[PDB]
Swiss-Prot record, chain B:
Name of the protein this chain belongs to: Metallo-beta-lactamase IMP-1
CDD domains assigned to the protein according to its UniProt record, in alphabetical order: IMP_DIM-like_MBL-B1
Species this chain originates from: Serratia marcescens
Keyword entries, A-Z: Antibiotic resistance, Hydrolase, Metal-binding, Periplasm, Signal, Zinc
Entry keyword Signal: yes
Lineage, highest ranks first: Bacteria, Pseudomonadati, Pseudomonadota, Gammaproteobacteria, Enterobacterales
Entry's localization field: Periplasm
């Protein structure tokens, strides 16, 4: 809702691996309960890259302040898809002239919704946000038409965002179930020996979260072809 | 409120694993929104066991018919705590002579509250609702003094009910916040190898949710303890 959910938990920040933190923010979402949303902060040269923003400007600000107060200035943010649990902090970041990144199709979907756009876009299937350290990849449509993943080669850590859905597919409103099985299969061959997979809405796992997502996508596609 | 013609999403039933269904019902919590409630239906060869009832007689009846028309006998239900979102359809199940179960303490709380009780009580820290297949465990007070969890040793699924609160404890009006940290740690140390953990009010996860609940219990205790 437009209002502040006064009793949600606060923004969480936790170290996942050597260069890498998980940030978790929380929102009240109709029909689901409280929903957690994980993103990352990846440090490069002791400068911070946000992988997805929190739901809100308030938690984006808290996140940024925490790292900046500790000497880690913000090099940029990248959003894995257009929904506000990935993109909600883009306007705040833009107002601080922190570069924000999104695919061309993500920015088009933001605009079509009258959302503020990232100030840096990329067309096409791979994008090195930081060569050999932060890569973006488009597996095809799934949770949404634009969803991308972020790969950290040096840690073998995959940020699957809202594409990774081990225990169920979540909000299907913008989903492409026909395509999701093919996308999930593609993603699983490519990142099969990830050490760690970070879903948006489920806590971190190993590479079996790729197989679970594929099974859930196969499952939802089947059920949808009914009564 | 929602309008007079507004209905909340309809009861959902979803396969979770070979023997095992999640059932999700909804109520509106006036100005927080619409909030889901998960229970299970556990299948042991053509018998079905309800793990928690929906909030309402009407959804308890929908849930029972769904399985009766797929050929199952409803052998009984068990309620994980006394709140309506676990016991709301005991009165209806009783009216159809489906055995209903709760702990001795849960039935006492129901009777205290002027509510219909389950027809069968158990008491003790472990209780087999179905030997080798459906186990009930009391971790200690937390969400409520009487909350219990259900364990399916053969799927390694834990139904944690409203005890499992990985994103925030929820309403503490009936809770024992001083006990919840200890109870949570006992629950974690017993079921740390669960393949799945099913909370009442958030989605299915893995055994991580045990750790998250402990963290939330401890932090809730701390917050309630500051002098401001
Ligand atoms: O593999 C599967 C399919 C996905 C899935 C979902 C759940 C589950 C339990 S309550 C819940 C809440 O949902 C709804 C509440 C309101 C509107 C739409 C959905 N969702 C349990 C297990 C399964 N497991
Ligand atoms: O602004 C909004 C409200 C929040 C929101 C959520 C989603 C979305 C898509 S799949 C998904 C997964 O959810 C959950 C997964 C587990 C538990 C409860 C929810 N969640 C998409 C867009 C919106 N956008
Ligand atoms: Zn989304
Ligand atoms: Zn999402
Ligand atoms: Zn309760
Ligand atoms: Zn509850």
């Amino acid at each position: 809702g437009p209002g502040v959910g006064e009793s949600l938990p606060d923004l969480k920040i936790e170290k996942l691996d050597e260069g890498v933190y998980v940030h978790t923010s929380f929102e009240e979402v109709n029909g689901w309960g409280v929903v957690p949303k994980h993103g990352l902060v990846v440090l490069v040269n002791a400068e911070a890259y946000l992988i997805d923003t929190p739901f809100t400007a308030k938690d984006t600000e808290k996140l940024v302040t925490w790292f900046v107060e500790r000497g880690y200035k913000i090099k940029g943010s990248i959003s894995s898809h257009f929904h506000s649990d990935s993109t909600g902090g883009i306007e705040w970041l833009n107002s601080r002239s922190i570069p924000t990144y999104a695919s061309e199709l993500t920015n088009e979907l933001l605009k079509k919704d009258g959302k503020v756009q990232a100030t840096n876009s990329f067309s096409g299937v791979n994008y090195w946000l930081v060569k050999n350290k932060i890569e973006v990849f488009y597996p095809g449509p799934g949770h949404t038409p634009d969803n991308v993943v972020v790969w950290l080669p040096e840690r073998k850590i995959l940020f699957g965002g809202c594409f990774i859905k081990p225990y169920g597919l979540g909000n299907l409103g913008d989903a492409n179930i026909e395509a999701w099985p093919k996308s999930a299969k593609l993603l699983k061959s490519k990142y099969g020996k990830a050490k760690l997979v970070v879903p948006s809405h489920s806590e971190v796992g190993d590479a079996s979260l790729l197989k679970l997502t594929l099974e859930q996508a196969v499952k939802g596609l089947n059920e949808s072809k009914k009564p």
